[PDB]
Design a protein around this ligand. Sequence first.
Ligand SMILES: CCCCOc1ccc([C@@H](C)NCCCNCCC(c2ccccc2)c2ccccc2)cc1OCCCC
Ligand SMILES: CCCCOc1ccc([C@@H](C)NCCCNCCC(c2ccccc2)c2ccccc2)cc1OCCCC
Ligand SMILES: [Ca+2]
Ligand SMILES: [Ca+2]
Ligand SMILES: [Ca+2]
Ligand SMILES: [Ca+2]
Length: 144
Amino acid sequence: QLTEEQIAEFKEAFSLFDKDGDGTITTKELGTVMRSLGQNPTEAELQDMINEVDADGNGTIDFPEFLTMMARKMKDTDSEEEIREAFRVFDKDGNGYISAAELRHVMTNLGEKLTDEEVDEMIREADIDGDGQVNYEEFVQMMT
Ligand SMILES: CCCCOc1ccc([C@@H](C)NCCCNCCC(c2ccccc2)c2ccccc2)cc1OCCCC
Ligand SMILES: CCCCOc1ccc([C@@H](C)NCCCNCCC(c2ccccc2)c2ccccc2)cc1OCCCC
Ligand SMILES: [Ca+2]
Ligand SMILES: [Ca+2]
Ligand SMILES: [Ca+2]
Ligand SMILES: [Ca+2]
């Protein structure tokens, strides 16, 4: 079910959160990412987001806890308003299509730097109709 690739892409994203590179994600680290993505949770909410995934109650999120949750099956009945919120961070022009630019812009804001190709390969794996962009329906499928 899970491939060494998905696992490796999950270790990368983990690194987006764990900025001090100590192998654990904190509420402070979660908050800064949330904000980079135009979200503004409170300490309490940050604390709630981390507790829900904190399988070992240690207070922070290690990779194993991250993989678990990240790989967890996102039902289609789930709160769609969340996926929607997620789509809006990318589609910054609100036109209904995520372009590599929009993807790039987000990465940059996440402290991430990618080659033009890294991003392109990213869009393509998301693209279903081949128009070179990612729409909502397409976004939904890969997110769930
Ligand atoms: C930039 C590489 C990091 C990959 O991270 C992730 C990898 C896989 C996932 C899982 C749960 N979703 C399904 C697989 C899609 N992964 C790559 C798709 C890509 C992407 C998103 C939108 C349009 C085209 C491509 C992407 C980039 C950055 C953040 C999330 C997604 C989430 C990630 O989100 C973490 C980022 C939170 C701010
Ligand atoms: C603007 C709101 C961002 C929510 O993003 C996402 C929301 C849900 C998912 C799905 C596929 N993951 C499983 C459902 C639980 N997600 C909440 C976990 C949370 C989280 C991460 C680390 C530690 C504790 C909690 C999170 C926040 C931001 C980005 C990814 C994950 C992926 C996202 O990543 C792709 C879009 C952002 C790059
Ligand atoms: Ca950390
Ligand atoms: Ca933990
Ligand atoms: Ca757009
Ligand atoms: Ca498309």
